[PDB]
Amino acid sequence: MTGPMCLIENTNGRLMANPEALKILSAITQPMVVVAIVGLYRTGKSYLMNKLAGKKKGFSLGSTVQSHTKGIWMWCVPHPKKPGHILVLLDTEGLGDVEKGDNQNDSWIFALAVLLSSTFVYNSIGTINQQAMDQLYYVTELTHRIRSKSSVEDSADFVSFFPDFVWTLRDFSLDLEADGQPLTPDEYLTYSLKLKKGTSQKDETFNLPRLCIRKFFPKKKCFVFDRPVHRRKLAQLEKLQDEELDPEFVQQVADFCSYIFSNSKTKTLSGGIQVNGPRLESLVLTYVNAISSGDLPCMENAVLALAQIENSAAVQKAIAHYEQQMGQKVQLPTESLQELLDLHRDSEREAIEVFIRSSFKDVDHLFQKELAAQLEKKRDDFCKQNQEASSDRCSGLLQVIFSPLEEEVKAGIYSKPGGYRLFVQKLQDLKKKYYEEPRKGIQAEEILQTYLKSKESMTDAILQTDQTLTEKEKEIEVERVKAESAQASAKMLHEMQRKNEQMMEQKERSYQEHLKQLTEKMENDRVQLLKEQERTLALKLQEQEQLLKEGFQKESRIMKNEIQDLQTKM
Ligand SMILES: Nc1nc2c(ncn2[C@@H]2O[C@H](COP(=O)(O)OP(=O)(O)NP(=O)(O)O)[C@@H](O)[C@H]2O)c(=O)[nH]1
Ligand SMILES: [Mg+2]
């Protein structure tokens, strides 16, 4: 991207995804660290975001008195500290002072920034006083804009998926002086979010936004920035060189950028899923569609929506893998059914592995069941092709090997004295030849036996004709031939029975292979979820302790409540 592009348009009160932007996202396959900035209009948000892009000329800037950015803009640039990663910068339409009304989608822009980011930067001018905290109603209001799941307490889940929070304070006017040594900006943020005792409406209003920031975001950070230049040059800031700006401001910006580059994490969804272009595109579509539908954007629903897409593709990818492996290894007709089934089993195992590693949230295992159904059909097709190839080969061999004999018999070559011995010897030699032919396939015994049985009268015809054989000797031969026919029948019957057994055995083995890989994936998913829950537990215990140490039992006890509820889910 040579420059930023609008990702979400905001026109006539409607938010809509920019198709051109979605197209760009579909092409970025690398993991993304998403940093979004929000705050009152004209507070230097776009200017600061251009610093992260590390380039002049990026997001367009406005004046110090008029709003500029509209909707949500994105700029995907290579991450300067993480090779193989993309840094996605989201610049947003400046918030208005609610105590003025209008600006309908302010809250939604704010909520989308929270849902789409890895790091959420709240930018304001001044200090953290009552005036500043009143504007944070936008954070308090998140409980009315975002839903964690669809299956006063839903917000208890926010800390598990919300971005890290960074408060950037512009034109900072405090020296932060304190007994001994000055407060650091992070200590100043802690000081600023401390609660006030009391149950009055005023007390509740003071504590609410502070509690929301402390409880909804997993990590908080603060950076202060001095006035960049003299008031008469603020409007030319973009064209000024670092040497023309306050040295401390230049260093503060450098420290902010360094922190972002070193601490902002790859955007992740439940299950450790790392968000890349196609995945972010899905989230944008789902959340914006929800808002456009008059519904609340829901994290759970978005993950599931993403699952639907990737799981469908996973089934197709697995089937493709199966077809490829079978095609590269099969030689028809196969020497035996075991040969074909062994190849099928191996290809199927690899295909299921492809599906398992490419899928997630396959509720009710519906997608894996679909895969199983498709592989079974594929297996049936190969089996049919194999039997057909065998039938063709064996019937062909029958023509090549036995036809000459049949014709000799019809020509009377064996109807002379001593012809029976010559005939039986020739027939045995020909049956041996048939059996020694390579890769006849699974129909070898059935094709031969059916033929030999249909021509049974031939043997008797030659026998009774030969005069060089006594009647007793002929009686012996008739019984010998009857015994050989019965043995040929047994070979055909066993061939039939064994094939059925092998098919049944393969059916059971395939079922067990699916179960094995599924059980293993479910186990891995359980471990990953518990790990995520343990992190949330750690974050909530931490806050509970801070609240108690701060002297607030009423709020600290409320935390213990959320902790108990989390533990019922573990
Ligand atoms: N006082 C002050 N002005 C700044 C600072 N950083 C940038 N500016 C100036 O403020 C004006 C607006 O900057 P811009 O980044 O467009 O602000 P914004 O927050 O993005 N406005 P909007 O939300 O409406 O899009 C420009 O003249 C810019 O030079 C700062 O730290 N302090
Ligand atoms: Mg702007």
Residue 116 assigned to a binding site = no
Residue 95 alpha carbon to ligand 2 centre in Å: 10
Domain boundary among the residues 220, 254, 270 is at: 270
Residue 92 assigned to a binding site = yes
Count of C-beta atoms within a 10 Å radius of residue 478:
14
What is the C-alpha to C-alpha distance for residues 139 and 124, in angstroms, rounded to an integer?
14
Nearest Cα residue to atom 14 of ligand 1: 44
Question: Cβ distance 288 to 10 under 8 Å?
Answer: no
Which residues have a beta carbon within 5 Å of ligand 2, which is an ion?
Answer: 45-46, 68-69
The token pair that represents 143 in the structure block: 């409980």
Amino acid type, 344: H
What is the C-alpha to C-alpha distance for residues 186 and 174, in angstroms, rounded to an integer?
14
Side-chain-side CA neighbours of residue 518 (13 Å): 17
Question: Cβ distance 544 to 522 under 8 Å?
Answer: no
Solving technique for this entry? X-ray
Question: Cβ distance 206 to 153 under 8 Å?
Answer: no
**Atom number, ligand 1, closest to the C-alpha of residue 62:** 16
Range 144-147, long-range pairs (CB < 8 A, 24+ positions): 145/107, 145/108, 145/110, 145/111, 145/296, 145/297, 146/111, 146/114, 146/115, 146/296, 146/297, 146/298, 146/299, 147/296, 147/297, 147/298, 147/299, 147/300, 147/301
Q: 448 and 331, same structural domain?
A: yes
What is the C-alpha to C-alpha distance for residues 249 and 255, in angstroms, rounded to an integer?
10
Side-chain-side CA neighbours of residue 348 (13 Å): 28
**Atom number, ligand 1, closest to the C-alpha of residue 67:** 24
- Phi, then psi, of 456 in degrees rounded to 5: -55, -35
Q: 225 and 365, same structural domain?
A: no
What is the C-alpha to C-alpha distance for residues 152 and 144, in angstroms, rounded to an integer?
10
What is the C-alpha to C-alpha distance for residues 12 and 148, in angstroms, rounded to an integer?
28
What is the C-alpha to C-alpha distance for residues 49 and 75, in angstroms, rounded to an integer?
10
- Residue 173, ligand 1, Cβ within 6 A: no
Q: 142 and 58, same structural domain?
A: yes
Residue among 237, 242, 248, 250 to mutate when testing ligand 1 (max atoms within 8 A of CB): 237
Closest CA to 144 of 178, 179, 99, 114: 114
- Residue 236, ligand 1, Cβ within 6 A: no
Q: 153 and 7, same structural domain?
A: yes
- Phi, then psi, of 266 in degrees rounded to 5: -60, 135
**What is the Cα 266 distance to its own chain's centre?**
15
SS (H, E, C) 116-157: HCCEEEEEEECCCCHHHHHCCHHHHCHHHHCECCCCCCHHHH
**What is the Cα 141 distance to its own chain's centre?**
31
Residue 66 alpha carbon to ligand 1 centre in Å: 10
Alpha carbon dihedral 434, 440, 443, 445, in 10-degree steps, equals 30
- Residue 414, ligand 1, Cβ within 6 A: no
Count of C-beta atoms within a 10 Å radius of residue 57:
10
In the DSSP assignment, the letter for residue 40 is B
Residue 547 CB partners (closer than 8 Å, separation 6+): 195, 553, 555, 556, 559
The token pair that represents 284 in the structure block: 């944008």
Q: 236 and 128, same structural domain?
A: yes
Q: Which ligand is nearest to the CA of 230?
A: 1
Q: In total, how many domains does the chain have?
A: 2
Tally the residues of the chain: 570
- How far is residue 120 from each of residues 61, 172, 299, 559, measured CA to CA in Å? 20, 20, 17, 24
DSSP string spanning 322-380? HHHHHHHH--SSPSSHHHHHHHHHHHHHHHHHHHHHH----GGGHHHHHHHHHHHHHHH
What is the C-alpha to C-alpha distance for residues 33 and 82, in angstroms, rounded to an integer?
10
Range 254-260, long-range pairs (CB < 8 A, 24+ positions): 255/223, 256/48, 256/51, 256/166, 256/168, 256/223, 256/225, 257/51, 257/52, 257/54, 259/166, 259/221, 259/223, 260/35, 260/52, 260/119, 260/166
Question: Cβ distance 67 to 92 under 8 Å?
Answer: no
Q: Give the E-state strand segments of 99-187 in sequence order.
A: 119-125, 164-170
Residue 565 alpha carbon to ligand 2 centre in Å: 41
Question: Cβ distance 422 to 405 under 8 Å?
Answer: no
CA angle 185, 188, 194 (to 5 degrees): 150
Residue 103 alpha carbon to ligand 2 centre in Å: 15
Burial class (CB in 10 A: 0-12, 13-18, 19+), 481: middle
**What is the Cα 147 distance to its own chain's centre?**
21
Amino acid type, 313: A
The token pair that represents 199 in the structure block: 């149950």
Domain boundary among the residues 270, 300, 330 is at: 270
What is the C-alpha to C-alpha distance for residues 537 and 15, in angstroms, rounded to an integer?
36
Q: 238 and 321, same structural domain?
A: no
Residue ranges making up the domain that contains 309: 271-566
Residue 379 CB partners (closer than 8 Å, separation 6+): 344, 348
Closest CA to 130 of 44, 37, 196: 196
Say how many Å lie between the first and final Cα of the chain, rounded: 43
Closest CA to 291 of 407, 145, 164: 145
Q: Which residues of 331-368 are buried (b: 16+ CB within 10 A; e: fewer)?
A: ebbbebbebbbebbeebbbebbebbbeebbbbeeeebb
Q: 192 and 308, same structural domain?
A: no
Residue 97 alpha carbon to ligand 2 centre in Å: 16
Asked if the peptide bond before residue 438 counts as cis, ω within 30 degrees of 0, the response is: no
Q: 191 and 66, same structural domain?
A: yes
- Residue 343, ligand 1, Cβ within 6 A: no
- Phi, then psi, of 274 in degrees rounded to 5: -90, 130
What is the C-alpha to C-alpha distance for residues 132 and 62, in angstroms, rounded to an integer?
22
Amino acid type, 88: V
Element spanning 69, H or E: none
β-strand partners of 90: 36, 74
The token pair that represents 427 in the structure block: 């027939």
- Phi, then psi, of 92 in degrees rounded to 5: -125, 160
Domain boundary among the residues 204, 235, 270 is at: 270
What is the C-alpha to C-alpha distance for residues 456 and 59, in angstroms, rounded to an integer?
92
Closest CA to 411 of 423, 428, 421: 423
Q: Are strands 273-274 and 268-269 parallel, antiparallel or unpaired?
A: antiparallel
- Residue 62, ligand 1, Cβ within 6 A: yes
Q: 276 and 171, same structural domain?
A: no
Q: 329 and 382, same structural domain?
A: yes
The token pair that represents 153 in the structure block: 């307490």
- How far is residue 17 from each of residues 115, 260, 292, measured CA to CA in Å? 15, 27, 10
Q: 345 and 248, same structural domain?
A: no
Coil, strand or helix at 15: strand
**Atom number, ligand 1, closest to the C-alpha of residue 249:** 31
CA angle 359, 365, 369 (to 5 degrees): 100
Amino acid type, 184: T
Q: For residue 399, what is the domain's CATH number?
A: 1.20.1000.10
Residue showing tokens 């700006």 = 245
Question: How many helices (H) does the chain have, and how many strands (E)?
Answer: 19, 10
Q: Are strands 119-125 and 14-17 parallel, antiparallel or unpaired?
A: unpaired
- Phi, then psi, of 124 in degrees rounded to 5: -145, 165
Q: Which ligand is nearest to the CA of 49?
A: 1
The token pair that represents 480 in the structure block: 């010998």
Residue showing tokens 């083995």 = 509
- How far is residue 363 from each of residues 24, 150, 299, 518, measured CA to CA in Å? 30, 15, 16, 12
What is the C-alpha to C-alpha distance for residues 416 and 247, in angstroms, rounded to an integer?
121
- The CA R_g of the chain, rounded to the nearest whole Å, is 39
Q: 445 and 303, same structural domain?
A: yes
Closest CA to 195 of 559, 547, 562: 547
Question: Cβ distance 76 to 90 under 8 Å?
Answer: no
Q: For residue 7, what is the domain's CATH number?
A: 3.40.50.300
